[PDB]
Structures are given as C-alpha cells and as structure tokens.
C-alpha cells in the first residue's frame, strides 16, 4: 500500500505543476518573445527589398 | 515541537496560495472587469450631455 509520504509527493507535485503552468501563462501574456519572421519594403532609390 | 503534518500544512498552504495569486493574475490580464466611470457627448440637436 502507498505510504502517506508517497501520496503527499503526488499531491504536492500536482500543486507545483499547477503553479508552474500558471506562471508560464503569466509570462506568455506579459512578455512572450515575438519572432520577426520576415520583412519587405519600398524605399527611395529603388530600394525595393531588404 | 512541530509535527511533520503541521509543517506540511504550512508548505502546502504557501503552494496553494502561490497558485491562487497566479490564477488571479491570469484572470486580471485576460478578463479583468472594466468600469465605465463616466461619459460625455456632443450629438445633433443640442444633445450635449448624456
């Protein structure tokens, strides 16, 4: 049978994983890095590509 | 002296409070209710107040 410590390990793990997922979600909403995937342009002197 | 359960109670409490604060932060960033505190207007026919 599972001891009390073995069960606590699983519950506390779930609580810290819940926290980790919430914190990741905060950081995405606030400061997720944004890729510049490409560029295009029309500029003077025929500068029509980057 | 404090038992193991009494100490676990305090640690698990901190983990669930950390989670609760993170979840509240998510809900603020995503869907915090916004008060309309006042209004003003200029509309036809001299309708210059709400």
């Amino acid at each position, epitope marked *: 049978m599972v001891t009390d410590s073995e069960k606590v390990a699983e519950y506390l793990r779930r609580a810290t994983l819940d926290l980790r997922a919430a914190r990741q979600r905060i950081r995405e909403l606030e400061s997720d890095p944004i890729a510049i995937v490409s560029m295009a342009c029309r500029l003077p002197g025929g500068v029509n590509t980057p | 002296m404090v038992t193991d*359960s009494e100490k676990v109670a305090e640690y698990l409490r901190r983990a669930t409070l950390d989670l609760r604060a993170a979840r509240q932060r998510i809900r603020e960033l995503e869907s915090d209710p916004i008060a309309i505190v006042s209004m003003a207007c200029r509309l036809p026919g001299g309708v210059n107040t709400p």
Partner: antibody
Amino acid sequence: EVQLVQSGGGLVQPGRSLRLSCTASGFTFGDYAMSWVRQAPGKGLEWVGFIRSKAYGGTTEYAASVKGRFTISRDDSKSIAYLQMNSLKTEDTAVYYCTRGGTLFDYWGQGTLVTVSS
Amino acid sequence: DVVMTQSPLSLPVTPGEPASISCRSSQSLLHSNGYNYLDWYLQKPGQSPQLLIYLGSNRASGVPDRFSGSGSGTDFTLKISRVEAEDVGVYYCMQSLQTPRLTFGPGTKVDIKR
C-alpha cells in the same frame, strides 16, 4: 504537452499472452508511478496494478484477480510502461487504461481494448 | 476497516443551471496535515476518465473553473456552477486515505434533465 499513447491489445485466445504498452511524452516519465486500470464492457473501473518510480523503489502491486498472471514493468529510457498479461481469461476482456500516478490519476491514456475469446 | 465512499446513483442536470454531487465516506478523510484525501474524477461516454478536483477542493490546471469541490470529514460536494451539455457522464468521488482503491464504484450518472 503530456501524452500517454497506448498500443498492443486486440483479440487473443484464452491461455495466451499479450503485452500492452503506454508510451509517454511531454513530462518526465521516470518521476511518476504508473498505473493500469481496466473497464469490462458496460461495467465499472477496476484497478489492475501499478509500478512505482525509481525514486520510491520501482516495485509493483497487483489486484488479487490478476496477481500471478499479469506483471507491470517500465523502461525509463524509452518512457514506456508495460502490462504483460499471461494466462488470459475471458473475464479479462476489457478496455485497459494506463494512467500517470499511483494515487492521483491526473492523466490517462486513451485505452486499449483487449478481447479474450476462442 | 475498509474505507468506502458513496454518491447518488443518478443526477439529472439542466445546462445553464448549477449542479451538486454529494459524497459521503465511511470514515473521516481529514488528515493531520489539514487536507481531506478525496479526489473527484469524471468519465465521459466513450472517453477515458479525467481528474477534476484533488484533496477535496483543489482544481487541477486545465479543468474548467465552473467545477469546484468542498466539504470536510465525511461529507463532500462537487459543485458545477453552470452545467454544460458536455458535462454528462459518470462522476466518481475517490478517497485516498486507504490504498489501493480496488474499484471506482458505481459513481454518479449525470444526464440531461427532462
């Protein structure tokens, strides 16, 4: 994301053997106990057995109805849990679920139907 | 000395409206650490089980926040604030004081009120 992908079941005759697998992805498999739970057609969920993580000794426990016929093992390098089923009987017919956790079953495989029939 | 839980056999529900599932154990599930060792699971038809609530009142990440749990000792409730039609299936309250759990029991069959 967390995935538990089950395979290896199907039709089998009484007395024969099958090995079910549960292939995990998206978490550290080696940190979790893994459990098997089964559901005979139209019936409730019955606990089959489970295996502990290495952190708690890697040992197994089994329901009395399968003890001495079924064995659970794990491969932490491939992230697979196995259910080895020997001496299968018709009443073993069931959908077999693998689940993460030995006490808290917080993520479940999609299930594998095993039909024992001659 | 075996620890069992019982919940209602059936429970018709109405989408838009709340629902409550009660749970009673043969023995207090309150541990010295302050938590009740009672978890709630749901099996939707043709789907595998899923966790909803652990240690009485903690909602796992990704579970809709219309689900909550409460209670203590021997009496527990799963509450759905506003039922959705996708919430039909079998709900199980499972004690974790005594392991292993050999069965999930008959659970509470939730279906559409009419």
